[model samples]
Target chain A: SGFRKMAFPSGKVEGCMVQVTCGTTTLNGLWLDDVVYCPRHVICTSEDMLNPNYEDLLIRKSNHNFLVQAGNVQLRVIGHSMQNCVLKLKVDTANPKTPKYKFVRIQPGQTFSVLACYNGSPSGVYQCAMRPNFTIKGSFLNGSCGSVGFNIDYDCVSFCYMHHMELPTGVHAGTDLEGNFYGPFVDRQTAQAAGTDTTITVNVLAWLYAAVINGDRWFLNRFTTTLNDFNLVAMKYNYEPLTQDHVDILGPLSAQTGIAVLDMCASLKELLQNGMNGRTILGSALLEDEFTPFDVVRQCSGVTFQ
Target chain B: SGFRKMAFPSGKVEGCMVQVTCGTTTLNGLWLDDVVYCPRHVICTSEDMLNPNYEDLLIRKSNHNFLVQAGNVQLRVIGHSMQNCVLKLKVDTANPKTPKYKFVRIQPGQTFSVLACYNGSPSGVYQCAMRPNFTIKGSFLNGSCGSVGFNIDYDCVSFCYMHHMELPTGVHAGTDLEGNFYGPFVDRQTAQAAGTDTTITVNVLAWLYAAVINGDRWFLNRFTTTLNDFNLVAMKYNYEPLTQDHVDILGPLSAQTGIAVLDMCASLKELLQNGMNGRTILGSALLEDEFTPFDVVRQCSGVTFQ
Candidate 1:
């Protein structure tokens, strides 16, 4: 009912590229004249450098929208974990806030390239209510609007398992990282969508970003196995008691609770479910297009890790 | 004690406009030339068009890259809940052979600037590992011969009870949105960080995110109060045994556990105690960086959420 209800503009723009980037900050507001580039890293304890302040030696970028440090920090954004935030349409900033451009919802590993309905001018602004609490209200530019499309993605939580299945142990292709295996199982190994492998692999050597940090990988596998019940179990069995010593207690706890994993899956799933129509496409073929600048595309969209 | 660890090139470019624009899709990997026009939003999520049979759209902005959206695709990234990953300096583009550069740790809302060290050069490579349990290994860029600089900017978590300070009774900020008070804190302003404010807020959220999924928020809150050694006399106390269902339930459990809040403060205190210095001028200025984002200087830091 959210972002997935996308209405696509009937056509094709071949040789396209998408860029994506992120810093250690939350995606809050945006600027118009220029894009706010927050520093990729911040050193909270390293206040000494501000002395003569050497810019050439330390930071590669600046004007960050947020702050940073060397330690760990986490924010538990509680909503409906595993909840889908679908897209309605391809945001053609080309006169946004108009009709013929709607949002859509897409499931994980889903794809879409269709021309659906063309609703008219949007009415009000974006509103979020806390119910007995405060309301966060927002608005969109007027040009073209779309609807939150249908979601074809499977609800892994739909299929629950009394216990977890054996790990799908394997070697990370390039890094050779190893770890237990799980699944968002596909019938066969397709080349990946746009050269990006749909299969999530975790390495034992660098489990931080590989395993622990990327809870979505676990959730996807969990989703594949459990199906619709994936969310239920994830919200249930996933938890780790904190030692209260190091900040990592929550790390393990999050890994157990699947909160982190659920969020990742949910966010991306919402994005992709709207992008892809849950259909299969050649991975290499999709990635062949070469139009938009790689850096811009990578920063704005996403890229293949492999 | 904040994110001013490294230095930049032109000394300082506080208002430089870094715009980034992108199409729908998570196509990672990029070079400067391949980059499209930078947009305002650091993390941009595009909506999928409504059409079901339209070919992938490709828009050519630069000579090296294109913006393409085709096929049902999903890109699952592990860590990086904190950092803007796209801005990271590419240390290892081709292979992980010679070990080009290693990644450093930076929490969310932080900043990473670079400067010159004894043997360090002007240009460098940097990356972000802001998400929970995020870590990275060192690697060499296949093409680059000389050494490069790597820096990061990270931010700490802000557990400010500010918004809720004025909230009325029987109401809270709620866990579904951003901000501390979203959890529906009844009597907001009256509470204090360590006393009423903290105690009531923590218990309320704990109950909201954890208890509901577990059972009743009251039970969770009461249990937490006891755990924290707080007085549970005021409210009607029940001694019913809280089951695994009570604690193990996922839903908001991960979010509810402010377990890291305690850990974060402890960690920061330790960093200061160890005499761990980052920059020169701001020698431990993090100590007084206010309880929130100071004007101009960003504040999304996960560690120091001030």
Candidate 2:
């Protein structure tokens, strides 16, 4: 759990805003001076100019303490992390060494979601790793007392694709034998047993209607499509990979394996059975961000991208 | 070469808003439904929520064209890239095959700057690579035409710390020998032979004042401190390495070489004599972002980050 945007004191403050301007050539220690929308469009490029906060105090490579104090504004942090860190929450800065409210069991390779707010009096201090790259901050006085700063990427949270459905002959939106309105369905099991068909106009119209009406106009564009077992036969036979466009979606083509789509999807579905909670299949970053898909979130995180 | 921000047209339509909501499950050929801050406090993190535009319509892995068309809102792209792809700018979608204004010489391992507008009849088609993750967009129609959507990172544009000045003896602001009002200056040569000590009151005052006056209140916090040859000598001799704090800035320790600080600084200064222009000795990302300083820009860029 991280930055509680407007939960704590100063719940009056709207959005998160860390005013500290950090440069790359910073030392192990820094400060997050306090200060302080979306959905209009949530693009993940550097242009998003998202609030890059969380001041990391890297006193050394592996030994240091990051201080997060609040001022007139509460410093909220939303990220994904955990490490050899002693998270000292709500502690006195003058006597930070003897922190009573601290998490001593913090270890590495842990993925903690962000969105926690830090306000006055009780500051936060963590004895953690180094943020070789750095972090963003906007607080009265905060510090990145470790090697790593909050490098926010999609990997900062549980990035997994939930249930997704697609169809081959590219189904649109209409009605089944039952005259209920259907949006867009063209995933795996659509054609195999399905009978009723819809017109492209209805399909397109309903889809657009949803995109615009769902308080989200950013829809339609795609990057990757999953092909399942039955889905395999549909693309190959029904649509008949006549054009390069169709074959392209059918995964990779090898002299020995032909269409690699089926195996990959199968392998994925099989692997996620254990950790998966919902139909939550970790597909790609199917959200607004097309840069680092959910699959690529880990690599970029590298557990270390910078 | 990066996003021009507000340089292009709809010159009237305020900010860039690529209204396409792309999820992770996308195929290669998506669209940049054409769409398309600062330093009040510039924090480099997901929070930055910068613009995630630049639709790269990835077809097959490598053979594809990223289309950037201009709608009523003019699609503006700001990024860093290139490859085996041919850049077809202002090409008609109906006859994209034979683009007149096409870049036949586009090759891999290239770094291209973004920030151009595509309007009316003309659009941009990059016959580049695929975007493994995905991209963001807001327009009528567009595509991530490749393996790489515009993965915006600091590496997108040229990121490097231009110039910096610090002093040893941990300086503050005061009047120099010439009585000129000086600010923070504890870099190297401060106590080497100079005199006329001002007060940290001035140092603190001038520093804080500059931070605010310069339209940049996010100041003071640090991550790394450079140790030049003089800096090595200064911190060692003046501060006397009495505490871990002093020793930390003095570079690494080696049984063979007592203080590696001097040698390291010397080596750095010598190596940068080649392509460096201006006093612009490439330091860290000393401007604002603490993550991925100038030095790390390459690795993240990998010439490839995501």
Candidate 3:
């Protein structure tokens, strides 16, 4: 349904390149001859990134095409040629099903090449669609529906803080005391056991949702306060705002995080529908530490015993 | 680190067909000139699937290498030629890190192409690796560590039921009541509200995991009962074992489910380590009904946002 195959640099080589930027990094992948050559954070993909809403760029490699996977964001550079890049999306978020979109899809069911990094960039402060001559940046916002109503961003990781939480793996889901969650600690004793300053104002399970795909490690200390104060579930990588180069490794967790957030859909809907002032986070963001980091993905989330 | 590029059907077109099979479906994709001409479930891939475990097949189409993605399972058919299908693996699941392996790598960070379907086939009645002139079938089991113990399967979906019940989107997670979960009736109020014959004996949260790749929509009512009598967490396609042709879709949910189970690593580890006569479900299995299936993927699991 997309021109991803057409998105690759035309048979022409020279200026045939896709410039992708995420967080503090920018990759200008050159489709030299047939192979792709780039500094880092640049991997190749011929498959679609699946969701049309996401506009991250990927470079297709070889005698074929290699997409540039800049951030967790996905994009479709519509054009007969890479230079004619046109990114257009129409979403009726209010009506989940009646949504309309046009973009090459990385049909689901392939491997995930997502990366999540952040050095505390303003959550909605960055977002953008992927285009050859463009970069993946800014707090992606769309206003066709009207006044600053709904926005989109790479909400890096999905986490929850519940009392007597039955968690699978250890992670750094934060709601209180910032870095206390930096380690993969669980609420072994009580929900507050994960942190020293953690507090639960209510008996209801506190659920949080936020983003940082183009590298925003700043877990919503503020978003949560504004929306579900106690339900603020935000995460940061070991290093804040990771360079897109190293960010390449993080791409694998993309879909995993999506699933995690989706698992909380019912709860998230209930939590946000009445609140949010009207703003709701509908996707996921991944959080990872440097290499030595323990695989805290919990694999991702939900409760499925091995 | 792989030579997937070299794996391309070389420059030769004639006799450049990679034979792939899963369940009753067989795809003989011809690398005619360039583009791939397979029947279905045949997608392209130039990326790495991250984990070296699964060996489901994929086709790298075009001037590139479109790995033939036949099942949710993954495989690396090592060789200088697609004809030399030498599938190998080295594991001491006992010692997680110290392991040896070979084959092409899909390195993660891309879209998923997974499909989950089964018509009730004998679990563990099948298994195999990927190589040209081969097919993705069987209940994949590896045993270098001795004993028929730690094997692998697609275990498509990850699900659980707690008393205070915390769930998101719903679909199927079976253990007690079979197919009663055919509808997405989440265990809203109590853990068993979705079923008429639902029961909750032990107050312990029930967890289940199983696999079905190469097309098997069968859910395990025995695994759970055998493992913990109640810890059984298995799923099936609305239709038991489906044909791989349509299975092309189920691949996208692969990693999402993986992360779901990974999230429960600790619980799974503790649970299986103590029980399991010595068997454990390390990953996740995805579940889906046909088209108007209502997108049960919820998208996957864990937590992230839009």
Candidate 4:
């Protein structure tokens, strides 16, 4: 509805310069330029150079002035000269009942260009409108909704007593300590044996997890003593402030004789949820401050293959 | 000198798990593992499994303990576990008096593992040594070494004239406006006439720059008044608070009836440097406030073909 043919003064010629206006927006001293536009709109012109005016404007021949050149995928919205407003265009297509929309903020008598491509094609009829600047607020923050807490007092700890671990490719991937590919660990003996043999690459983290579940006393003691004494896990990952909550969770593990993998996973999950919920027990100076012990365990475990 | 055979108690065998001590560090219940380490002293081990004494460690036969299996790369430094120190391994190969070093922070009684690969191969002999944690400071900041200020008050403004521009490919790159390739402008008449012919695409930005330089009064006045009244350059790029510096440079363009392309380019270069230097003449609230008008001009100039 807002589209209009540009006007020219009397005796205007092809090479002559003229004032070009659409709505209240005007381009002063513009060349009487022309374009081939889309192949579909080729050979079409909205005005005669001799008698150019709004009436002489070729509406039907110009396809209602909705011509966009091929290889071009944008539209320029010409604004009214008088006000601070936003130009809005609703593009309707035949197959889709819902129309697509394009918007641009425009001050008085200015042009605002915007991309107008839709569904890989730009052939469509569109109507234009303008409105004052406005705002909408009061929505809830994204991803900050619910909470589900864990019950288990399980805790998994990394070892402080260092040993030579190998990665065949020296890269991290997979899900098992054997490092054949991603898989669940069955027992400690198989993982420990594989660490000695050359055919298998070790998954250090997975081996530890499997050993802990199967109750390998050697690994279990190593894990527990490392956390209790050196605070190595906290230091290595840069997670600090040994809080009472973490202590309360890890305390039962030391006293208990037998602990399973599921038990540790639950504790790790709980510890992780504290940070994911933006309320971490172990405070961090990082901006996001989200900590997942699983990420650390998984990354460190891959470095050593049993 | 550091390698020693791991000793086991009487009647103990290979499969038995036991605590292994070297210097001060002890690996609790570590399996007597194997590796195919570097060829330079492949076989190595250290031990006094029963007496648990560091000095009584078997050093010669443990050379078999230095094995690292094929396709894997890492070196282990058995540290004197009694002190707070760092283990350094000088990896020397086929050379005299010079070697590369690897280091790892070691707490008492811990094994410090490090990468042993050099020149894409791990077949190098390395000697282990101990050192205290050292500190070095007073180094200069990187990239804070040089400064060359801009000389020209270069500024170029984009035009506001509404026109249909074409790039058959609708993408940047090419020699000329026909969008065949990118190149400098020919002239406005040739570019304007090509817009009517069906074969040519346009170089929009190039056409405007050329027109301004060629002194097309129509285009010149349009560009001038757009900058003066509508502030299209500021509004188009969302760069505002057009400072006195920008005005002092651009003010001459409006007062004078003509402007050279290089004159405008100089102004733009200065304007860009101001922002990039983090001391923008036009104040920006953006944390990263670098903007180049030449980039905008060069991009726009190539939309139509002449």
Candidate 5:
């Protein structure tokens, strides 16, 4: 395309500005005057910053309006114009949708001029209905909204005590402790090893959660203690897990969390219908103390991986 | 940082899991339990394809709370078990010099778990004040004032025009044309010996002023008609010369299509008071006349060079 590029004031060339090129053959050694418009459109804006709820103020300009820009534009008007005198402006000021101008008189002995600024991204046709005495109505609108409730508790006593034990090795050992946790612990041997590693995780995981969760916020210490204290086989629990094979048939380990024991819908519900459960189980108590591993791992053994 | 990154299910040390080796220290055997979470802050959007306004519907992520960024921390309640709660979720529940938590509630019957998302940025602290859920009443102590009318029109106008005309050859064109009309009828004989180049120049000069210039809105146009049409002001309407010394004073030269006088404004009040004064004063009757170089590029006698 044989088009001339314009470079001066900043502007975009789309959806506006009609371009035309009269071929050389049309001119007889003479340059002709071709009317090309610098396009513009009416925009709605706020008249007062302090009055957030004010209506939209519609003003037209002669350029492609960019998004998220703030500034003002000047307009020229004809004198003695009434409330609805339509004039040919650079922008289309007759579209009656979206932000449209309300009729206001451009009063007697007044010049055809106006100063309008934009503060929004409204799409569609707009109107600049002229009224007598240069009065404007309508206000600019902004798009934005407001959040709900919940909480969290994951006790970090283990990470804290382990961290204290690691301090003797170094003073600034917290960063290294995170690296320790980056490698998960599988059993007591690995868990105990962190105490001597000279670098141990801190209780920050608790503070991190407590400081951030939005609703019903909870701390890690008590939350973790409660879960650890919960009993799986207590009558207050409900979820069932396959324990053995043979007549019972063996199956994969259950994926549900140990918290399932608190489900009121479970078979163990009747025990704690009125109040909290009161029971204690010693950590030293092993499977061997209650049932044989072969008899349990193979037969009817109710187990859940937490 | 000799650390072993472990993966779930396979217990492998790659992919999601990996072994860390700081210097020669390598932690290789371990599996990690991973958890996933989605923030409660979700945005609902809609679009209309059939309709101009119906073409878009998008679910945007946003903040419902008074938070400005992600690293900013907050607290919430996770479960109802009080004794097991490890942290306190506090909210400023009233308007006071020192806002303090006055309400206590928890997410019932579930283990609280804090889910943090990666909003990588430095942290900042902020104070949040909740807008009232319902309206509150307060009386205005000061009386109100209203006005019936106020006037603010202030601008003046100046006008000029351009014209275009054709002169047939074979007659005493210069002597006769100038004798009948206002013109030196300066014939650039050499420039015109080859063709039609006799030209006339028209100038418009005025000082613009406005009490409160409506810099945002206003227009200027012609208001009267003359025998010869008008042309725009010359190259030096208000522009300074390129060189430090020599400067040019340019003005309008109306087209021969009759004069075209354009209105100018001293200020907003004058412009609105006078309106568009379309008068053609300088060019010929034909619409093909062009302004000569002297009209738009001449120097005023009193002005000194250098």
Candidate 6:
């Protein structure tokens, strides 16, 4: 929605080579005139740069795995590692003419269950360890990050989840780790019934996860306790409320939310409902063609996912 | 939206007056840097400490009326009486210097349908009442809500509503009544179709009724819920759904959907196609003005009211 056709304010954009300065930082990236290039980490907050282990906090590329779950209706990339990781997600490998790519971020050790949906049994890829400073085209040019790491090349339409789930005590994961154990019998119902406070925490965490990944404010606003309902039980049970650490880690989602190719609300809901373990429940409703911009689709039709 | 800069923090505003705070309350009645005399009861919530007839609570001002059948471009404040109804509404009258006075509140016995609008007429008021503790001038004195129920007087570029049906069932007129009977809908569509729910239920009842009333969460949410789609047929046909007591009284527009307004989506569409009960459909894009706040207005240049 923030994407309006305004005159490009700054920067020299002439083909692949691009230079833009945000405050004191001069950033360079491949710029495609028609495509949106969002500023995520490069032009960021002081807390981010202050991290002692900042530079080394890169995602371990080898940990990347593509899983097509949700009854063959959705695809996601799973990866572990990093306090900060930036990657470009592209879907539908077979159709090269119009490629759809969503530039997303993953906080340190958080799971990233993004949307990847399309017809004809999807194929996709996750190019990890990429920084926001480089353009989508430029990032992949450097190739593999040595023998110890590799970029993902899959044969399915897909999206990715950059979450590192150490699964909290109350939540259960699949035996073989295909997807987390989810059903009516999970701790959610029990927690609500017994006032254990687990479901509320999980619900909040999932919302936080979405807010951070996509930089979506809707998720952030609700996650940060704007609504009374959010803090109702937490206040009563003395449950752990959202902390600044969580906000910082998921910071990029707020920016991402505004510009992403998908509706932040639906994406977050999907992330919340099926983000445990390696399971994903993002249905085909979230899928979009590469050329189909988020705002364009929103105007033509109402938000179906909401 | 609630960020009105009013002095809060300490003084008597420190305790009970503080208890009467609203999450979205901007609170700017009579602010002296030291003293805290809030008519939060007259102006706000139940944690109030001022009322004697706490249960028989009254707004301490007047019996507001619904002249849905607009004579000029305005409706009216039929009369006055609750215990402490200190309000601030603007209105128009015959004298340009003494504009109209709109002290709106729907006591139990009043029928709805207050002001209906059309082109070339505006006969309404923006009343601003005064409280015993605070001064309207101290409020509007420095240009706030000070000692003044001084009616508004406007010269007009106007608008009007053609609805003046005598009002229908379930709605009543205040003879010498206290709180009026408000339960379920005598007829929302019919009332709106024939035209009502304009004030009796919407304006006064929502506020006065909630305070001096049952304090039903339903009424509060709905009075604020008008912009939301008020109804969705019970998911199942035989669903118990909203009964008479539920509908007749405390009918808030559902915050659940954005699709419906002006009488649900279907009704509005019908109204657009054909005017109701003898009135022609208004084509001016201006129909949205009342519902859509100016802050909600975009800076776009051209608008054809039609």
Model 5: how far residue A161 lies from native, Å: 41
Q: Top model by lDDT, which number?
A: 6
Residue-level lDDT of model 6, residues B19-94, one tens digit each, is 1122322222211122212222333232433233432443443323211112233323333233222222222222
**By summed lDDT, which 10 consecutive residues of candidate 2 chain A come out lowest?**
A1-10
lDDT of 1 by residue, A98-147 (tens): 12221232222222221111112111111111111110011111111121
Q: Write the per-residue lDDT of candidate 3 for residues A105-203, one digit (tens) a residue.
A: 211111111111121111111011121111111111111000010111121111111001112132122111111221243323323322222211110
lDDT of 4 by residue, A120-224 (tens): 211111111110111100011111011000100112111100001112211111111111221121212122212211100011222233334323323232222
Model 4, residue B90: C-alpha shift (Å): 11
Please give the distance, in angstroms, between residue B144's alpha carbon in candidate 1 and its true position after superposition.
14
Give lDDT: candidate 2, residue A10: 12
lDDT of 2 by residue, B34-113 (tens): 11100000111223223311223322212112223332432233321222121212222332121111112111111221
Question: If you assessed candidate 3 against the hidden native complex, which CAPRI class would it receive?
Answer: incorrect
Q: Considering chain A alone, report the TM-score of candidate 2 relative to the true chain A.
A: 0.19
Model 4, stretches more than 4 Å misplaced? A1-294, A300-306, B1-51, B60-62, B70-306
Interface RMSD of 3: 20.7
- TM-score (all chains, Cα) for each model: 0.18, 0.18, 0.18, 0.16, 0.12, 0.18
Q: Give the runs in model 6 whose Cα sits over 4 Å from its true position.
A: A1-306, B1-27, B30-84, B87-101, B104-306
Q: What is the model-wide C-alpha lDDT for candidate 4?
A: 0.20
For model 5, residues B1-306, the per-residue Cα lDDT tens digits are: 000000011101111111211122222111112210111111111122122111121122112221211112222212111111011112222112111111112111101001001121101100111001110011001010000000001111000000111122211111110112112222222222113222112111111111001121123334542212222222223221121111122123223112222322122123224422332121111111111112122111011110
lDDT of 3 by residue, B113-228 (tens): 11111111111101111111111111111110000111111211111110111122221221111112223332223243332222111101112211221112222222212222
lDDT against true structure, model 5: 0.16
Q: In angstroms, give how far residue B236 of model 1 lies from its true place.
A: 30
User: Which structure among the candidates has the greatest DockQ?
Assistant: 3
Worst 10 residues of 4 chain B by lDDT: B1-10
Superposition TM-score, candidate 3 onto the true structure = 0.18
